[PDB]
């Protein structure tokens, strides 16, 4: 460990927006933390990014203002960024920089960890099999998820995704309720939440919701407003992810990370790239943002020899309700699945307006079946899905021509669409439904058709369950 | 007053496109004017655009050609461009750069004014509300233009916008009824000389060439002086308005060529592009061209602009029409479909709009029923167009009586109201009576845009 006095320089050679270029620094370190002292005396921090001979550049996490070519000092610790982390972080609140904001004490660290963390060896990773209860009807049964499974939430401006996040974080539970309840109740879910580029109103809505739940015994909150500087957002997610790693792989608990507004992260990275004059990719975003999103989306899954788990549940906004926009596409190439909250459903006041049609959850493949959830599950979702798609086709054909050309089968499809939207989609504010109930509701929605119409269902299962 | 002898440097360190760089230049004066002596002796001119260190980039009004880095010379004025202004210039003709065309002399220049002009104090503005007599029913009554306003006309190739300009500059008057007259100002913008000849002939047709400040510029002339010409014309208008107590009917033409020249200059200067590749500061440039208008306290004069422009591909979302719409209040939008229907004056009444109804009309000026008549007519025309679109497919059989009434009203509106003719000046009262006669076809019940009192008062005739 380092056992030498710190070092200080004063040669400042320019400021280019959120960057500060400087000269005559001996033996610097790439990715090294720098402190700053202003003429007025305030303190600041930064990160060395570029290095070339004696000249080096940094990035002030809180912007540049009042800096001077000769009346500002800088200090090089000659060490990679080491963050503090303890189990005591539960129940606390902080800003992006990690300093307290809720009047509480300074951080009292249990250990120093690396911001970049480390690349986990894939062989230790245990493939998830548990299927987590969500309470939501659209996610359970149809696009379910697992413990350790990283799923995003696609949404847009003005959509009510915030309370969807509230619901999914509040109604967390396990679906293995068919056994003794006492051993079931031992399990809880530590939550770590990292606001980022989020206005005051949504932040207070979330903290009031958490206070209503009374779950601050196991909630860590990192906060960011709009008025704060922008470059904090470059490092804000990583702090939360590292703390989640420590709370999972060392404290043995089950953690659930929440990330907010990744398009803001992309915007901040693009701003840094615009300052850094590197080669721009499509829509001006740097080429290596793919690898950056990879590095921030891989800290998930459980590991051998332990029993904790890490589930990634980010939310991101699509400008102009676009799907081929860069950030949605690249996130689709990193994350395994999608949800696609839709504006059209929200226009007719259906809450939550979850569009099942473009959704996907690959890891449903082995997360369901006899013993896990129910003998007869997947084909029900497939039949409902194909019926929904064909019903939407019939709806389009009705729009093009009119009800005159529709057959009786088309009428059956249309009433299926109506009932499907009315019952299965619409749930309500705090309607915590069970898995068996949603399966029963699916069977109910299937009942309207006779045996002949269904095509993607085994006849044995139909004879087993349909006649009741 | 400048008792400083002039300078001249031969250090031409380069030429790239329409730009020229001068090294070892001593203490550059920004936004300067310089003169150039070609080796064969021809004179040229330009303005200094950029300065940095002992270097000075300079753009040439007439365009780079023949310049030699070792033989040519350049001399420095030390003052921003100042143009000669004069009240006796009326009845004369000059090119874009201002030199005489009719074998006239160098103008005796009552003063030297800044080409770039100066802004106007906000608090020193007075709102204009006097209605102008145009003689066109589609303007007087629907899109009435008042003094101190800058309505353009959006026209495409082959449209009779030139004749509309002729009519508006010929039948100018005052609605509110000593003598009156409008000091015409006009500058061409590279238009083909046939239109210039037609405008000249019509201006003698007016019979008041003594009040015709004219400027010219043809397509074959250098493109880049088109950036200067309108500013010179506007300076002349400023001088004749706020120094001689005169009203000036400033009119321009073919702003698309101006936009193209500015685009070429910007491309040569590799600035950050915008929509369709246009310059970013095209908006601010257009602002400096247009907002120089109105009338101020302590002066009875006023400035009226009619900057007609070309409209490529008849596309409303094309940037030049869009930005011109933002910077101004009103529009006319002569129609291609009407001209193909063989009707004159072919002005589409619906897309047009004037924002000065708020004070130009009303009781004490024209009448207490002008605004509601116009609103009712607009609504009836729009719904007539909609039912026409419906009839285009549905067929007359499934329609109702209201639909046939609306179609007949539309037919009457087009055959009578719009049809005005080339030399038949009409009064405001006649247009109001014609509109009332048109509206009489509908019974009173379905008139949803007229108050009860006016409807009872005027309808039963």
């Amino acid at each position: 460990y380092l056992s030498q006095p710190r070092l200080t320089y004063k040669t400042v050679s320019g400021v280019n927006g959120p960057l500060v270029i400087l000269d005559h620094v001996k033996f610097p370190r790439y990715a090294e933390i720098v402190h700053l002292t202003l003429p007025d005396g305030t303190k600041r921090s930064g990160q060395v990014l570029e290095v070339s001979g004696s000249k080096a550049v940094v990035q002030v996490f809180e912007g540049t203002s009042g800096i001077d070519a000769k009346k500002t000092s800088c200090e090089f610790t000659g060490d990679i960024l080491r963050t503090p982390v303890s189990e005591d972080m539960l129940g606390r609140v902080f800003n992006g920089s990690g300093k307290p904001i809720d009047r509480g004490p300074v951080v009292l660290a249990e250990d120093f960890l690396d911001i970049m963390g480390q690349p986990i060896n894939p062989q230790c990773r245990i493939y998830p099999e548990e299927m987590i209860q969500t309470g939501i009807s659209a996610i359970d049964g149809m696009n379910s998820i697992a413990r350790g499974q990283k799923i995003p939430i696609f949404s847009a401006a003005g959509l009510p995704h915030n309370e969807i996040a509230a619901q999914i974080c509040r109604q967390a539970g396990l679906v293995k309720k068919s056994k003794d309840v006492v051993d079931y109740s031992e399990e809880n879910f530590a939550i770590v939440f990292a606001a980022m580029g989020v206005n005051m109103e949504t932040a207070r809505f979330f903290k009031s919701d958490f206070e209503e739940n009374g779950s601050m015994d196991n909630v860590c909150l990192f906060l960011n407003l709009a008025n704060d500087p922008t470059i904090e957002r470059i490092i804000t997610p990583r702090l939360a992810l590292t703390t989640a790693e420590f709370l999972a792989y060392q404290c043995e608990k089950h953690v659930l990370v929440i990330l907010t507004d990744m398009s803001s992260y992309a915007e901040a990275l693009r701003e840094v790239s615009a300052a850094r004059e590197e080669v721009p990719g499509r829509r001006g975003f740097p080429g290596y943002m793919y690898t950056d999103l990879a590095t921030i989306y891989e800290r998930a899954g459980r590991v051998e020899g332990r029993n904790g788990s890490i589930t990634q549940i980010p939310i991101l906004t699509m400008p102009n309700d676009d799907i081929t926009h860069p950030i949605p596409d690249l996130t689709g190439y990193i994350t395994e699945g999608q949800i696609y909250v839709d504006r059209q459903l929200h226009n007719r006041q259906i809450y939550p307006p979850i569009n099942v049609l473009p959704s996907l959850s690959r890891l449903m493949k082995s997360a369901i079946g006899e013993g896990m959830t129910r003998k007869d599950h997947a084909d029900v979702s497939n039949q409902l899905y194909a019926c929904y798609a064909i019903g939407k086709d019939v709806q389009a054909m009705k729009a093009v021509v009119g009800e005159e050309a529709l057959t009786s089968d088309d009428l059956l499809y249309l009433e299926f669409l109506q009932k499907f939207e009315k019952n299965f989609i619409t749930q309500g504010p705090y309607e915590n439904r069970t898995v068996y109930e949603t399966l029963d509701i699916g069977w109910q929605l299937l009942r309207i058709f006779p045996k002949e119409m269904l095509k993607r269902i085994p006849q044995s299962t139909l004879s087993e369950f349909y006649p009741r | 007053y400048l008792s400083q002898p002039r300078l001249t440097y031969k250090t031409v360190s380069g030429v790239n496109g329409p730009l020229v760089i001068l090294d070892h230049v001593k203490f550059p004066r920004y936004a300067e004017i310089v003169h150039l002596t070609l080796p064969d002796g021809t004179k040229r001119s330009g303005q200094v655009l950029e300065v940095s260190g002992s270097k000075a980039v300079v753009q040439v009004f007439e365009g780079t050609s023949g310049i030699d880095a070792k033989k040519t010379s350049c001399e420095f004025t030390g003052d921003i461009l100042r143009t000669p202004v004069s009240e006796d210039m009326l009845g004369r003709v000059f090119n874009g750069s201002g030199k005489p065309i009719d074998r006239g002399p160098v103008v005796l220049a009552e003063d030297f004014l800044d080409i770039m002009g100066q802004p106007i104090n906000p608090q020193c503005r007075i709102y204009p509300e006097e209605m102008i007599q145009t003689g066109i029913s589609a303007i007087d009554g629907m899109n009435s233009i008042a003094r101190g306003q800058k309505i353009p006309i959006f026209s495409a190739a082959g449209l009779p916008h030139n004749e509309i300009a002729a009519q508006i500059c010929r039948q100018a008057g005052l609605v509110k009824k000593s003598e009156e007259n409008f000091a015409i100002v006009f500058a061409a913008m590279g238009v083909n000389m046939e239109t210039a000849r037609f405008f000249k002939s019509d201006f003698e047709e007016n019979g008041s060439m003594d009040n015709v400040c004219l400027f010219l510029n043809l397509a074959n002339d250098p493109t880049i002086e088109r950036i200067i010409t309108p500013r010179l014309a506007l300076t002349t208008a400023e001088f004749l308005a706020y120094q001689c107590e005169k009203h000036v009917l400033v009119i321009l033409t073919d702003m698309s060529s101006y936009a193209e020249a500015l685009r070429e200059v910007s491309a040569a200067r590799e600035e950050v592009p915008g929509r369709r590749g246009f310059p970013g500061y095209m908006y601010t440039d257009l602002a400096t061209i247009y907002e120089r208008a109105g009338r101020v306290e302590g002066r009875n004069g006023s400035i009226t602009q009619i900057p007609i422009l070309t409209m490529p591909n008849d596309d409303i979302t094309h940037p030049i029409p869009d930005l011109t719409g933002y910077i101004t209040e009103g529009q006319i939008y002569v129609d291609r479909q009407l001209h193909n229907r063989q009707i004159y004056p072919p002005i589409n009444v619906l897309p047009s709009l004037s924002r000065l109804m708020k004070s130009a009309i009303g009781e004490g000026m024209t009448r207490k029923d002008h605004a509601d008549v116009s609103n009712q007519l607009y609504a009836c025309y729009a719904i007539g167009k909609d039912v026409q679109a419906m009839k285009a497919v549905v067929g007359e059989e499934a329609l109702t009586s209201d639909d046939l009434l609306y179609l007949e009203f539309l037919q009457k509106f087009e055959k009578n109201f719009i049809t005005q003719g080339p030399y038949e000046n009409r009064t405001v009262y006649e247009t109001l009576d014609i509109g009332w006669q048109l509206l009489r076809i509908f019974p009173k019940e379905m008139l949803k845009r007229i108050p009860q009192s006016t409807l009872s008062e005027f309808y039963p005739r």
Partner: peptide, 18 residues
């Protein structure tokens, strides 16, 4: 195209540092 042109010119002027 404009963005690529700008960065190419930037690289060029950087090349003529000496």
């Amino acid at each position: 195209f404009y963005r690529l042109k700008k960065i190419q010119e930037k690289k060029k002027i950087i090349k003529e540092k000496f």
